[PDB]
Amino acid sequence: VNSFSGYLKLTDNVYIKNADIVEEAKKVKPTVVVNAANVYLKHGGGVAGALNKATNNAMQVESDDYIATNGPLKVGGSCVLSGHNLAKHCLHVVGPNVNKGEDIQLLKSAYENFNQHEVLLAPLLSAGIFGADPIHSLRVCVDTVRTNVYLAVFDKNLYDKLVSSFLE
Ligand SMILES: CC(C)[C@H](Nc1ncnc2[nH]cc(C(=O)NC3CC3)c12)c1ccc2c(c1)S(=O)(=O)CCC2
């Protein structure tokens, strides 16, 4: 139903909340939930692990069948698969992992995938153990995405830092 609540409005199309993306998906029932995926769709840790465990491993089983016949994605690319019990669809987006040496310029391409969907629930791409500067990831989101994006950031200190930095 795309019924989002409790978000701060940063721009006319970008919203942010201190929340777990899994709990937001259960409450909102969005048309699209974004996963911060890797190229072979191995959802072991972080955001991808939280989403997969909330589907009771259905997301990993579907992702393994997709990779067996289609092979890996590219950095900056995306794949629409089922959203299972969390959303109508899951948009698996691969942002660059700068801690593993990948190019930060590809973060723009990663966010450009969001423009194919009118409204999305999403994490902050390439943050956490992917190592991108989170303030820079928020700036790329704001400058690239034109559709309605609801960012769930599950860390109060990081949320407060992002909001303070944006309001400078
Ligand atoms: C910056 C984080 C606060 C954020 N995490 C989250 N953000 C929003 N809903 C979440 N639910 C569980 C989370 C989660 O990370 N759960 C683990 C047990 C810690 C979580 C996040 C944002 C983007 C990325 C990652 C992590 S990652 O997985 O480290 C690498 C991929 C990019």
UniProtKB/Swiss-Prot annotation:
Activity control note = Inhibited in vitro by GRL-0617.
Subcellular location as annotated? Host endoplasmic reticulum membrane
Reactions listed under catalytic activity: Thiol-dependent hydrolysis of ester, thioester, amide, peptide and isopeptide bonds formed by the C-terminal Gly of ubiquitin (a 76-residue protein attached to proteins as an intracellular targeting signal)
Membrane topology term reads: Multi-pass membrane protein
Q: Where is the Macro domain?
A: 1-168
Oligomer status and interactors = May form homohexamers. Interacts with N protein.
Q: What does this protein do?
A: Responsible for the cleavages located at the N-terminus of the replicase polyprotein. Participates together with nsp4 in the assembly of virally-induced cytoplasmic double-membrane vesicles necessary for viral replication. Antagonizes innate immune induction of type I interferon by blocking the phosphorylation, dimerization and subsequent nuclear translocation of host IRF3. Also prevents host NF-kappa-B signaling. In addition, PL-PRO possesses a deubiquitinating/deISGylating activity and processes both 'Lys-48'- and 'Lys-63'-linked polyubiquitin chains from cellular substrates.
Name of the protein described by the UniProt record:
Papain-like protease nsp3
Q: Which organism is it from?
A: Severe acute respiratory syndrome coronavirus 2 (2019-nCoV)
Portion of the full sequence shown: 1025 to 1192 of 7096
